[PDB]
Symmetry: D2
Subunit: 215 residues, 4 copies
């Protein structure tokens, strides 16, 4: 007598060539999903796929070398992978430039890279999820999003913007089989476990939430 | 390739003879734990165990007929079940008496029944969890705890008090292997799935959180 | 051209013989209200009234020597001061006893002293406020109420319980002229300024809020 | 014996030619400040100044006809009004376009109009505030910012982004005499009363907060 995290589903994970994204990809692969590793450089994609195979032997893995911060990379991903049952928004940049030194262009660029990329991926993949009556959309945002640090104001603003995006799209997709949730990290596999549970069919009564996986 | 919710652990669940508590007990049993069903009347305990066996055939189930709102019932439970790896605080009462009609005795009784019972169970079972280096303590509190309704002020106060209890004991037990979390319901098995994941060894990086399982 | 914080109103403040309560009393007195200083010992009440007069010369001040933690002291206060336009709940105790050492009696006593005292005062003074169509009820709760520390679990539980009380009674008294709000301190006159604004007729569109006055 | 909201200070208020902004301007003027009314059309600026004078007779009022959403309008405002002791960020647009119909350009435009305009004004006016050791920066954001509606996802994202901006810049300007706070409306003068108190020297121990003025 046990309970399972199991998939015959397709899961795309942005920025999955390193760190938390790679751990999420490896966990979803170990759960039996078809995981799409997406990075700007094909070399990093290949090395991430190899790392995943090291741990999960019979892993179901594809790769797309694209820059999801731009519309061109998003279109390339949509061409190679038109359908996703699980979307994991994890691509994001970060600096610590002082508030009075960061110009308008940098604010707009951080918004376009950290927020609008996930919005693009969700806008593309959500309709088919709604049609099949089941879907999972998961935003990975740091705890800096709830309490903006003060030396990283741009980044915290983008993180809370992502939290808002996931909350609002959850309310918008309510009633369908698609859930939208955010996951907050601060042991990488421990973080990935929560993303796996959320992507699993068991998290079906959790939408518009923010789930913490800090220490 | 899949991922598991599995137990060789003992899990006691208060008020587990009906409703959300019974669903939590059934889910933990299906996950392979040894679930202790606790109710005031032994008849209800037996019927709940039978209901659980209906769905999970080889279920590992014990029962204790006790009134956990009182110290006598808590002592009886501690005599029959001295050790727990997983504790699920779910016993609680509720009315809708107008704020200006409810007297002091009723405020104190609601606090003793809804809050201090869980405090008693946690105070007893937490030390052995800390000694073995692993444990799970889970509070089931309604969404009325975050936004106190106004026609149910006593109940909402007790619910937010429970949220405070779980947050504080999580911080107190940090560094040990024991996590303390709260779960917020508003499909009973869907609620139970979150409690099962939290009770599972995978939720090991989630402590002091409030997890929603509303629609 | 200026704007005023002015009163012809009666304001009772619990635990107003020292510290934050005394500062709140002095600020409300300087704003022109009739402030009732309440403490267990008449000597402390007299010395607090004298301190207030030191700063505000033509202060409107009465005193009641009562122990508001008990029903007897509350009844004495209601006998000496049957009507209040402004109620400020500030009486509360605090220790740092370890969670596993504090017994049931101490949990119940902290609830009765820190939470039920304010509930008693509000239950008595709110109806006349609702009748005259205007009233202010203000709970003073520390920031430990939103993030329970872990070494002061009982106190944080009571503080969040008070926050719940104020939120719920605000919703219950909505539509009337009575507002219920909580004020969170961590310069005592700086704290008192917020309480004065809330007690003033200008805060009339703020009910069920938690207002911070930390550094 | 009373307490005062008084100014010899300069207060600039964006989008102050109508609605909540005009009410905030009128309240700050009645409190005795020098209020700068800023709108895109000089006709609207003049009519707003006239409306303010109708209620406060000896009002201290200047005007700037500029479009603060653009850098050109912000530079014009900074040329006409190089110094501000009080800054009130209120300029913002809003639609209800469905999430799947709103394109990238619209997301970026909403971010630039609703968020980056206030960031520009704050970046310009905050240093002189920090130099003189006293300042107030106030963001007016709707309650849609804390609970993103779902049919207005772009707008709610921008509102929570503004909340993040004010929180982070408050932490960044902590220790100086400048406070940064957000005010949440859902009787316009009732809203303006809170902004006036925050702009007043009495709100000096409140920074990084979100203050509600809904019904």
């Amino acid at each position: 007598i046990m309970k399972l995290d199991l998939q015959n589903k397709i899961a795309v994970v942005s920025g999955s060539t390193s760190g938390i994204g790679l751990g999420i990809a490896k966990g979803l692969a170990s759960a039996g999903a078809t995981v799409v590793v997406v990075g700007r450089k094909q070399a990093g994609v290949d090395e991430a796929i190899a790392h995943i195979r090291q741990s999960v032997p019979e892993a179901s893995l594809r790769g797309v070398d694209a820059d999801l911060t731009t519309e061109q990379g998003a279109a390339a991903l949509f061409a190679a992978e038109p359908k996703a049952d699980i979307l994991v928004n994890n691509l994001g940049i970060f600096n610590d430039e002082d508030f009075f030194s960061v110009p308008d262009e940098e604010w707009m660029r951080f918004y376009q890279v950290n927020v609008l990329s996930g919005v693009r991926l969700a806008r593309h993949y959500a309709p088919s999820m709604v049609e099949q009556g089941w879907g999972r959309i998961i935003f990975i945002s740091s705890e800096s999003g709830v309490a903006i640090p003060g030396d990283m104001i741009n980044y915290g603003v983008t993180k809370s913007a992502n939290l808002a995006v996931s909350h609002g799209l959850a309310k918008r997709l309510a009633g369908t089989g698609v859930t939208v949730n955010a996951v907050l990290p601060g042991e990488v596999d421990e973080v990935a476990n929560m993303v796996v549970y959320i992507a699993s069919p068991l998290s079906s009564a959790t939408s518009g939430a923010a789930l913490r996986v800090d220490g």
